[PDB]
Amino acid sequence: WTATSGSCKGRCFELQEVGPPDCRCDNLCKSYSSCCHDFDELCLKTARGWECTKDRCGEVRNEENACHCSEDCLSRGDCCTNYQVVCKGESHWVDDDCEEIKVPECPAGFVRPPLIIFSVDGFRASYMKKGSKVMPNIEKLRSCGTHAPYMRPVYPTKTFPNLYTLATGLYPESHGIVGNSMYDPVFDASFHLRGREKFNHRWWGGQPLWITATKQGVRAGTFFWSVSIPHERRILTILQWLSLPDNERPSVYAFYSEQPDFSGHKYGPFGPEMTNPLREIDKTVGQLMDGLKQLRLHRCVNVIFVGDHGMEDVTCDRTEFLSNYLTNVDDITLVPGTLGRIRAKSINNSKYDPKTIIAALTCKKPDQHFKPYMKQHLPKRLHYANNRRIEDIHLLVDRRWHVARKPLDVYKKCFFQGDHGFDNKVNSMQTVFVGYGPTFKYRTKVPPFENIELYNVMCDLLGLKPAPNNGTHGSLNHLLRTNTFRPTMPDEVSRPNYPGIMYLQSEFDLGCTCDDKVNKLEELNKRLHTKGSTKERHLLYGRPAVLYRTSYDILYHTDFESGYSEIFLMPLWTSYTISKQAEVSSIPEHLTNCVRPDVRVSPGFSQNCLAYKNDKQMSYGFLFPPYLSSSPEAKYDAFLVTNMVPMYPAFKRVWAYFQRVLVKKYASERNGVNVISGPIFDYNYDGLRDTEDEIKQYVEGSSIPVPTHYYSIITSCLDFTQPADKCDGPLSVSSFILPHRPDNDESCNSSEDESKWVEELMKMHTARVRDIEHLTGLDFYRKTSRSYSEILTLKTYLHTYESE
Numbered sequence: 001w002t003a004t005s006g007s008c009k010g011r012c013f014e015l016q017e018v019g020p021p022d023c024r025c026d027n028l029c030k031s032y033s034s035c036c037h038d039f040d041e042l043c044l045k046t047a048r049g050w051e052c053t054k055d056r057c058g059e060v061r062n063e064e065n066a067c068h069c070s071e072d073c074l075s076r077g078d079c080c081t082n083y084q085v086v087c088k089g090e091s092h093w094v095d096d097d098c099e100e101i102k103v104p105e106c107p108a109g110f111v112r113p114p115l116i117i118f119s120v121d122g123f124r125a126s127y128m129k130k131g132s133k134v135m136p137n138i139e140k141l142r143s144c145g146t147h148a149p150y151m152r153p154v155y156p157t158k159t160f161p162n163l164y165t166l167a168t169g170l171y172p173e174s175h176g177i178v179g180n181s182m183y184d185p186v187f188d189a190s191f192h193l194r195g196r197e198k199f200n201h202r203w204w205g206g207q208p209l210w211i212t213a214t215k216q217g218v219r220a221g222t223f224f225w226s227v228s229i230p231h232e233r234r235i236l237t238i239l240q241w242l243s244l245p246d247n248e249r250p251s252v253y254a255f256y257s258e259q260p261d262f263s264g265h266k267y268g269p270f271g272p273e274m275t276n277p278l279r280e281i282d283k284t285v286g287q288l289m290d291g292l293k294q295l296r297l298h299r300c301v302n303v304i305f306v307g308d309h310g311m312e313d314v315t316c317d318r319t320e321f322l323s324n325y326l327t328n329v330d331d332i333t334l335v336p337g338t339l340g341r342i343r344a345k346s347i348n349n350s351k352y353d354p355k356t357i358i359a360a361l362t363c364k365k366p367d368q369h370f371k372p373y374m375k376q377h378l379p380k381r382l383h384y385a386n387n388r389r390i391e392d393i394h395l396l397v398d399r400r401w402h403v404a405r406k407p408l409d410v411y412k413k414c415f416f417q418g419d420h421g422f423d424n425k426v427n428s429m430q431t432v433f434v435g436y437g438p439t440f441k442y443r444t445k446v447p448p449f450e451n452i453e454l455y456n457v458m459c460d461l462l463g464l465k466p467a468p469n470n471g472t473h474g475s476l477n478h479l480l481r482t483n484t485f486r487p488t489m490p491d492e493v494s495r496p497n498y499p500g501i502m503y504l505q506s507e508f509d510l511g512c513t514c515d516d517k518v519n520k521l522e523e524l525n526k527r528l529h530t531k532g533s534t535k536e537r538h539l540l541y542g543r544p545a546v547l548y549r550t551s552y553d554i555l556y557h558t559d560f561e562s563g564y565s566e567i568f569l570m571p572l573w574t575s576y577t578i579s580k581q582a583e584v585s586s587i588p589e590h591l592t593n594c595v596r597p598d599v600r601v602s603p604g605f606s607q608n609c610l611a612y613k614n615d616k617q618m619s620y621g622f623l624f625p626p627y628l629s630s631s632p633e634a635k636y637d638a639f640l641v642t643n644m645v646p647m648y649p650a651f652k653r654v655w656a657y658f659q660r661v662l663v664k665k666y667a668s669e670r671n672g673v674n675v676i677s678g679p680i681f682d683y684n685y686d687g688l689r690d691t692e693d694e695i696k697q698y699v700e701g702s703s704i705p706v707p708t709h710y711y712s713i714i715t716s717c718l719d720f721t722q723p724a725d726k727c728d729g730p731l732s733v734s735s736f737i738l739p740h741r742p743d744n745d746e747s748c749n750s751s752e753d754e755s756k757w758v759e760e761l762m763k764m765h766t767a768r769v770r771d772i773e774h775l776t777g778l779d780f781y782r783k784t785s786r787s788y789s790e791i792l793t794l795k796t797y798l799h800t801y802e803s804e
């Protein structure tokens with residue numbers, strides 16, 4: 001209810017939203033059915049089109065016109081965008097050579113370059129190249145400004161999660177918009193595209209850019225447009241606000257285009273009907289730039305051209321049906337499509353069982369086009385678990401596919417040829433980024449990056465301090481000519497101890513046994529290895545900093561260095577370099593079940609073999625792999641109890657293959673590698689290092705905590721003609737966070753040889769170094785010759801394993 005009796009005279013696209021029941025004249029009024037009676041007439045004028053003509057030139061103003069071609073239009077700020085071109089012999093912005101914008105070239109009384117954020121729904125990354133012929137305005141922004149070959153969306157790659165990630169710099173799990181569709185069990189409410197509930201404020205967490213701006217005294221232009229306001233009118237309105245007096249003019253503006261997503265759904269990402277929507281978007285950008293140029297603002301404003309996700313080929317026939325797997329189909333609720341989320345239809349049904357549902361959904365058909373997960377077992381890179389709105393059971397759907405509950409759903413609810421929502425590493429889900437203006441670099445291509453990063457940069461562009469977020473601030477400094485953010489390294493909280501030899505062998509009663517009984521040339525030599533004489537070789541980038549309060553030791557050895565935790569009874573990290581020439585050897589049998597006391601570490605701070613013997617499910621592995629020891633004598637070090645970690649037999653198959661085969665392979669392909677491995681404990685799946693009291697599982701009868709995951713960080717020279725250990729320039733990294741699981745149900749091929757499936761598993765759980773920092777509270781690459789910004793970029797890098 002509004003007294004829709006009031007008027008919109010001199011209120012058209014008012015910047016503050018007014019309190020019902022007085023009627024509203026803002027760009028959002030329709031979506032709340034609250035516009036004044038006269039809104040359409042006053043604010044949505046259409047008369048005479050969107051363009052001047054030779055004969056409308058110098059005309060007498062007629063207020064009914066959509067836009068003006070009279071002399072005064074300029075001062076008034078309401079000409080058609082093509083006025084100067086038609087009436088004053090000016091050229092279109094697209095037809096001008098580009099010229100470096102070294103400084104903001106702004107009208108007097110602008111305190112900062114304005115930022116215009118132009119967002120295009122479903123604009124797949126490859127459109128920049130594949131549609132380059134029909135998008136000349138966008139092509140000029142791209143090639144003249146700063147661009148990435150693509151931008152990585154967040155999962156799920158849907159419109160609401162991604163737009164709200166752009167606004168906030170947060171993962172969906174933190175900002176709370178975890179899908180286009182959602183059930184919040186605490187509110188007992190549902191969120192849907194259709195309806196009122198989505199307008200309620202309790203859905204939207206974090207602090208979006210417009211709120212950050214207001215709180216800090218930067219005026220923001222209402223970001224949101226009622227769907228039936230046509231594009232031309234959005235543009236003109238923005239150009240209007242830009243002519244406002246200094247004290248009322250917004251500094252930041254948003255345009256949203258429903259295209260090309262809307263057509264891409266109907267016709268597929270590359271349907272022949274896709275050319276026109278791309279031409280129309282380019283024309284809109286052309287109108288913006290021509291209008292900016294008319295106001296002499298085209299070398300003053302920073303423009304960001306950004307998509308929320310791409311678009312994949314998806315059809316009705318590529319549907320998997322849960323009713324083909326589950327006998328109990330009507331006792332579950334499915335959130336369907338390009339992802340699945342399952343819960344109990346009724347939480348009074350105590351006979352519902354997630355374990356049995358997971359099992360009936362696992363590896364059932366030879367080419368199953370979805371894989372079920374407990375949310376906490378999803379790839380950590382997705383950051384999709386720590387929200388009560390995310391169901392315990394998740395289905396990751398193959399690209400090109402849909403999951404539905406029953407066939408009735410798919411034909412009693414083909415229509416569509418395109419969809420999106422899949423895993424965010426999927427090529428067809430990648431979207432765009434272009435930045436153009438005084439603050440962005442000129443003719444510069446930057447590497448791909450993730451959209452969680454942009455919030456920080458839009459804050460930089462506006463001189464705002466960002467609210468706490470998931471971007472890594474400074475990792476996108478290389479996009480910017482100035483306004484860079486110069487972060488310092490987090491300070492180390494705990495300093496390590498460096499223990500010497502303090503214990504006698506016979507003080508250890510651990511049930512551990514080792515067959516190990518054997519000069520001065522090589523007795524001084526082992527001692528210097530233990531003092532750290534090869535640390536320079538195996539610790540290339542400094543030791544990681546521990547960013548929390550704890551008690552740990554640095555342990556030096558011939559082949560590897562480790563930071564051993566006295567609290568968790570194992571290393572936090574283990575570091576070693578494997579050169580291109582290194583050789584794999586086997587574990588001798590006088591050594592197979594050997595575990596040796598470490599005479600630098602008390603019995604009390606050590607694991608014991610007995611607990612592994614008692615624990616019928618749990619076994620153990622090693623962080624530094626004995627396969628890769630440098631000499632028979634060094635190989636004993638690999639068997640120290642301080643190199644030992646708890647491992648399920650199922651997981652050891654994974655680990656042994658990685659250590660025995662893949663590490664050498666990466667050293668061959670990359671010209672040496674540096675490896676840092678270690679355990680992760682994330683029992684509450686928040687993406688953050690657990691404290692000791694969060695640990696849910698210990699090796700039977702002991703205090704040895706069981707990791708949920710195992711990481712490795714594999715670094716080399718980007719220029720691979722130099723060995724990892726003598727690298728003159730930038731670095732190259734890949735990492736993983738492997739789930740530590742008692743079975744291999746995740747890999748449907750796992751009863752075959754590891755060469756068939758282990759590597760694919762690792763690819764799926766590829767990670768950013770930054771993900772591993774959050775999960776461990778360590779800070780890596782402390783001592784390089786590289787700039788800190790270049791290091792933040794490296795730490796945010798993700799090796800996706802998709803082709804070109």
Ligand SMILES: *[C@@H]1O[C@H](CO)[C@@H](O[C@@H]2O[C@H](CO)[C@@H](O[C@@H]3O[C@H](CO[C@H]4O[C@H](CO)[C@@H](O)[C@H](O[C@H]5O[C@H](CO)[C@@H](O)[C@H](O)[C@@H]5O[C@H]5O[C@H](CO)[C@@H](O)[C@H](O)[C@@H]5O)[C@@H]4O)[C@@H](O)[C@H](O[C@H]4O[C@H](CO)[C@@H](O)[C@H](O)[C@@H]4O[C@H]4O[C@H](CO)[C@@H](O)[C@H](O)[C@@H]4O)[C@@H]3O)[C@H](O)[C@H]2NC(C)=O)[C@H](O)[C@H]1NC(C)=O
Pocket residue numbers: 170171173174175176202203204205206383386387388468469470686687688774
């Ligand atoms: C991505 O970046 C983000 C942003 O930096 C990171 O998320 C932050 O992580 C912090 C560490 O976990 C977290 O800090 C906690 O905040 C609690 C108070 O928080 C409120 O106020 C803030 C500030 O404005 C607000 O933003 C929060 O908003 C959340 O809550 C509502 C949902 O109800 C949503 O609208 C919103 O979307 C957001 O939800 C998300 O966050 C929460 C956790 O805050 C999740 O549970 C949700 O699922 C969702 O993901 C809040 O309204 C504060 O109480 C916490 O402190 C407890 O724990 C410590 C123990 O050491 C103690 O010091 C405190 O006293 C307190 O303990 C007591 O209560 C305990 C819990 O109730 C209880 O167990 C004890 O017995 C104690 O008595 C804590 O400081 C911060 O809020 C979020 N922020 C956001 C926006 O998400 C994120 O980690 C990054 N991700 C990665 C991978 O890096």
Ligand SMILES: O=C(c1cc(OCC2CCOCC2)nc(C2CC2)c1)N1CC[C@@H]2CN(C(=O)N3CCc4c(O)noc4C3)C[C@@H]2CC1
Pocket residue numbers: 117119158159160163164166167180193209223224225226227254256258261262306
């Ligand atoms: O005004 C907006 C809009 C803008 C915007 O910007 C944020 C900027 C942040 C700064 O940086 C850049 C962005 N944030 C939001 C919300 C996140 C706050 C909304 N919208 C877009 C969304 C909905 C979907 N839509 C629809 O039909 N689809 C429903 C969902 C969907 C899907 O997933 N595929 O097709 C569809 C079709 C109707 C409505 C259109 C108008």
Ligand SMILES: [Ca+2]
Pocket residue numbers: 681682683684685686687688689690
């Ligand atoms: Ca945790």
Ligand SMILES: [Cl-]
Pocket residue numbers: 156158178179180181335
């Ligand atoms: Cl969804």
Ligand SMILES: [K+]
Pocket residue numbers: 612613614615616617618619
């Ligand atoms: K065992």
Ligand code: NA
Pocket residue numbers: 744745746747748749750751
């Ligand atoms: Na399997």
Ligand SMILES: [Zn+2]
Pocket residue numbers: 122159261262265420
């Ligand atoms: Zn869509």
